[PDB]
């Protein structure tokens, strides 16, 4: 029963270059408008010694407006839910892998997120916190064998100009028998709308809309 208003509760446990951390968040979203928003708080490992922007895409494609002509794999996956696994290879050797197990408690999504990154150069934009925002991204979704997957070429804008590229690959796994969709795109807009000085508190907004190839 995906309702027009849904709640979000999440915990992320992770480490970057071996430094552990934990983040908890609460939020709300509009599945049918493709809109979501959440408040995120650092519980362990603060102040984070890395750019927060590498975590935001880990903090649910149900919050994407799907037209009637495209199969909605994500709204179709509940109340059992689904999970995904993701790799993110940055242009300077930095690599992140993350997972999210999404379940349902009434009208509230529950995220169990794991996030790990290594090989970020000490002088790079991530360890030095020189990232600004994610550019608008186009996610390419497709089904290979019997598995829904997605690819992405994302770009982080840097302070002082330039961009920091990231190659992303995601695997989705439904916990029930759902209709697999046909290839299509999802355009994403993600933005930190507010944060305190050390990002121990963050307000994150996301907007997603599915389009055809």
Author numbering: 6 to 64, 68 to 221
What did the study's authors say about this model?
Reversibly switchable fluorescent proteins (rsFPs) are essential tools in super-resolution imaging. The much smaller family of rsFPs exemplified by Padron are referred to as the positive switching rsFPs. Jakobs and co-workers demonstrated that only two mutations around the chromophore in Dronpa led to Padron, the prototype of a group of rsFPs in which the resting nonemissive off-state is the trans anionic form of the chromophore (trans−) which absorbs in the visible. In this work we apply ultrafast time resolved infrared (TRIR) along with TA and time resolved fluorescence (TRF) to characterise in detail the photodynamics in all three chromophore states (cis−, cisH, trans−) of the positive switching rsFP Kohinoor.
The structure of Kohinoor had not been reported. The chromophore structures are similar but not identical and there are also subtle differences in the wider structure. Comparing the two structures, the F176S mutation in Kohinoor reshapes the region around the chromophore. The loss of the bulky aromatic group apparently increases solvent accessibility and relaxes the steric bulk that contributes to the positioning of the neighboring Y162. The resulting shift in Y162 allows S145 to adopt a more favorable interaction with the chromophore, with a reduced hydrogen bond distance of 2.7 Å in Kohinoor, compared to 3.0 Å in Padron0.9, and a more favorable bond angle. The more open local environment also allows for additional conformational flexibility of the chromophore which can therefore adopt a slightly different conformation compared to Padron0.9 most notably in the methylene bridge region. Changes in that region are known to modify excited state dynamics in other FPs and in the bare chromophore. For example, the F176S mutation and the shifts in Y162 and S145 will change the protein environment around the phenolic OH, potentially suppressing ESPT in Kohinoor. Significantly, the cisH form of Kohinoor, which drives on- to off-state switching, was shown to behave very differently to the structurally and spectroscopically very similar Padron0.9, in that no ESPT reaction was observed in Kohinoor. This was assigned to small structural differences between Kohinoor and Padron which modify the environment of the phenolic group of the chromophore and to the different electrostatic environment and chromophore structure in the two proteins.
